[PDB]
Amino acid sequence: ATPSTLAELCTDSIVKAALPPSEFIQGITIDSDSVTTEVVTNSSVSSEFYPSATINYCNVTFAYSHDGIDGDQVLLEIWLPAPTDFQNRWLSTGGGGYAINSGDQSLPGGVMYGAASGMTDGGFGGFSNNADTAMLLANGTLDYETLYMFAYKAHRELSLIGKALTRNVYGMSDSDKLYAYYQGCSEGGREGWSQVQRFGDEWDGAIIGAPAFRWSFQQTQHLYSNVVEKTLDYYPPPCELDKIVNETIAACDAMDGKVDWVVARTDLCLLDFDISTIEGKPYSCAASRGTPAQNGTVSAKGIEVAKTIINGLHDSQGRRVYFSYQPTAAFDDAETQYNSTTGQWGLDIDQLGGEYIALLVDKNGTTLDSLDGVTYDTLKDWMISGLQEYYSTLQTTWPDLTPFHEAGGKVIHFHGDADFSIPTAASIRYWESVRSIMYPNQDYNSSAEALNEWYRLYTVPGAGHCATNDAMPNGPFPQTNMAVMIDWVENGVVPTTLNATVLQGENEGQNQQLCAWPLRPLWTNNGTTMECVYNQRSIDSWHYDLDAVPMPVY
Ligand SMILES: *[C@@H]1O[C@H](CO)[C@@H](O[C@@H]2O[C@H](CO)[C@@H](O[C@@H]3O[C@H](CO[C@H]4O[C@H](CO)[C@@H](O)[C@H](O)[C@@H]4O)[C@@H](O)[C@H](O[C@H]4O[C@H](CO)[C@@H](O)[C@H](O)[C@@H]4O[C@H]4O[C@H](CO)[C@@H](O)[C@H](O)[C@@H]4O)[C@@H]3O)[C@H](O)[C@H]2NC(C)=O)[C@H](O)[C@H]1NC(C)=O
Ligand SMILES: *[C@@H]1O[C@H](CO)[C@@H](O[C@@H]2O[C@H](CO)[C@@H](O)[C@H](O)[C@H]2NC(C)=O)[C@H](O)[C@H]1NC(C)=O
Ligand SMILES: *[C@@H]1O[C@H](CO)[C@@H](O[C@@H]2O[C@H](CO)[C@@H](O)[C@H](O)[C@H]2NC(C)=O)[C@H](O)[C@H]1NC(C)=O
Ligand SMILES: *[C@@H]1O[C@H](CO)[C@@H](O[C@@H]2O[C@H](CO)[C@@H](O)[C@H](O)[C@H]2NC(C)=O)[C@H](O)[C@H]1NC(C)=O
Ligand SMILES: *[C@@H]1O[C@H](CO)[C@@H](O[C@@H]2O[C@H](CO)[C@@H](O)[C@H](O)[C@H]2NC(C)=O)[C@H](O)[C@H]1NC(C)=O
Ligand SMILES: *[C@@H]1O[C@H](CO)[C@@H](O)[C@H](O)[C@H]1NC(C)=O
Ligand SMILES: *[C@@H]1O[C@H](CO)[C@@H](O)[C@H](O)[C@H]1NC(C)=O
Ligand SMILES: CCOCCOCCOCCO
Ligand SMILES: O=C(O)c1cc(O)c(O)c(O)c1
Ligand SMILES: [Ca+2]
Ligand SMILES: [Cl-]
Ligand SMILES: [Cl-]
Ligand code: NA
Ligand SMILES: [Zn+2]
Ligand SMILES: [Zn+2]
Ligand SMILES: [Zn+2]
Ligand SMILES: [Zn+2]
- Cβ within 8 Å of residue 77, ≥6 positions away: 59, 60, 61, 101, 107, 118, 119, 120, 121, 127
Q: What is the 3-state secondary structure (H, E, C) of 164-186?
A: HHHHHHCCCCCCCCCEEEEEEEC
* CB-based burial, 286-314: b 16+ in 10 Å, e otherwise: eeeeebeebebebeeebbbbbebbbebbb
Q: Identify the nearest ligand to the CA of 121 by its number.
A: 1
Cα 36 to averaged position of ligand 13 atoms, centre (Å): 6
Q: Identify the nearest ligand to the CA of 341 by its number.
A: 7
Kindly list the distances between the CA atom of residue 474 and the CA atoms of 185, 481, 523, 532, in Å, as whole numbers in the listed order.
21, 20, 15, 19
Q: Coil, strand, or helix at residue 444?
A: helix
* Catalytic annotation present for 186: yes
Is 224:380 a contact under the CB 8 Å cutoff? no
The helix (H) or strand (E) run that includes residue 429 is helix 424-438
Domains of the chain, first to last: 1-174 (no CATH), 178-214+396-476 (3.40.50.1820), 219-391 (no CATH)
Cα 238 to averaged position of ligand 17 atoms, centre (Å): 48
Structure determination technique employed: X-ray
Query: End-to-end distance of the chain based on CA atoms, in angstroms?
Result: 51
- Cβ within 8 Å of residue 391, ≥6 positions away: none
Is 193:98 a contact under the CB 8 Å cutoff? no
What is the distance between the alpha carbons of residues 14 and 323, in angstroms, rounded to a whole number? 52
Backbone conformation region of residue 448, classed left if phi is above 0, alpha if psi is from -120 to 50, else beta: alpha
Sheet with 410-416: strands ordered across? 28-45, 53-66, 74-81, 115-120, 89-93, 179-185, 205-209, 410-416, 455-460
Is 31:60 a contact under the CB 8 Å cutoff? no
Cα 92 to averaged position of ligand 11 atoms, centre (Å): 13
* Catalytic annotation present for 465: yes
Q: Hey, CA dihedral for 525, 528, 534, 537, is it positive or negative? A: positive
What is the distance between the alpha carbons of residues 68 and 502, in angstroms, rounded to a whole number? 51
Is 158:120 a contact under the CB 8 Å cutoff? yes
Of 245, 390, 399, 418, nearest to 324 by C-alpha is 418
- The 10 Å Cβ neighbour count of residue 41 is 11
| Helix extents (H) in 275-326 | 300-311
Kindly list the distances between the CA atom of residue 300 and the CA atoms of 277, 279, 281, 328, 353, in Å, as whole numbers in the listed order.
10, 6, 11, 19, 27
Amino acid present at 448: A
What is the distance between the alpha carbons of residues 15 and 34, in angstroms, rounded to a whole number? 11
What is the distance between the alpha carbons of residues 75 and 276, in angstroms, rounded to a whole number? 54
Is 322:411 a contact under the CB 8 Å cutoff? no
Is 91:118 a contact under the CB 8 Å cutoff? yes
State the number of CA atoms in the 13 A half-sphere of 333 facing the CB: 30
Pairing of strands 282-285, 294-297: antiparallel
253 is in an annotated binding site: yes
Q: What is the 3-state secondary structure (H, E, C) of 311-324?
A: HCCECCCCCECCCC
What is the distance between the alpha carbons of residues 23 and 29, in angstroms, rounded to a whole number? 6
Q: Cis (ω within 30 of 0) for the bond into 550?
A: no
Q: Which of 186, 194, 427, 538 is catalytic?
A: 186
Q: Is the CB of 40 under 6 A from ligand 1?
A: yes
Is 540:267 a contact under the CB 8 Å cutoff? no
Cα 408 to averaged position of ligand 16 atoms, centre (Å): 9
- Cβ within 8 Å of residue 479, ≥6 positions away: 47, 48, 49, 50, 51, 500, 501, 503
Is 436:397 a contact under the CB 8 Å cutoff? no
Bridge partner residues of 360 (DSSP): none
Q: Hey, CA dihedral for 430, 435, 441, 443, is it positive or negative? A: negative
Instruction: Label residue 318 exposed, middle or buried (CB < 10 Å: 0-12, 13-18, 19+).
Output: exposed
What is the distance between the alpha carbons of residues 238 and 295, in angstroms, rounded to a whole number? 10
Q: Identify the nearest ligand to the CA of 131 by its number.
A: 9
Give ion ligand 13 contacts, CB < 5 A: 37
What is the distance between the alpha carbons of residues 305 and 225, in angstroms, rounded to a whole number? 8
- Cβ within 8 Å of residue 137, ≥6 positions away: 143
Q: Coil, strand, or helix at residue 31?
A: strand
Per DSSP, the residues of 67-91 read TT-TT--EEEEEEEE-TTT--SEEE
Q: Which of 350, 421, 465, 538 is catalytic?
A: 465
Q: Which atom of ligand 7 is nearest to the CA of 337?
A: 13
Of 46, 171, 172, 64, nearest to 118 by C-alpha is 64
Q: Pocket of ligand 9, candidates 105, 217, 422: which has the most ligand atoms within 8 Å of its Cβ, to mutate? A: 422
| Angle at alpha carbon of residue 218, lines to 216 and 222, rounded to 5° | 110
Bridge partner residues of 66 (DSSP): 28
C-alpha 303, offset from chain centre: 29
What is the distance between the alpha carbons of residues 41 and 50, in angstroms, rounded to a whole number? 19
What is the distance between the alpha carbons of residues 443 and 435, in angstroms, rounded to a whole number? 10
Q: Which of 419, 421, 427, 538 is catalytic?
A: 419
Q: Coil, strand, or helix at residue 473?
A: coil
Q: Is the CB of 140 under 6 A from ligand 6?
A: no
Bridge partner residues of 244 (DSSP): none
Kindly list the distances between the CA atom of residue 282 and the CA atoms of 148, 160, 285, 535, in Å, as whole numbers in the listed order.
51, 58, 10, 36
- C-alpha torsion 398→400→405→409, nearest 10: 0
Q: What are phi and psi of 338, to 5 degrees?
A: -85, 130
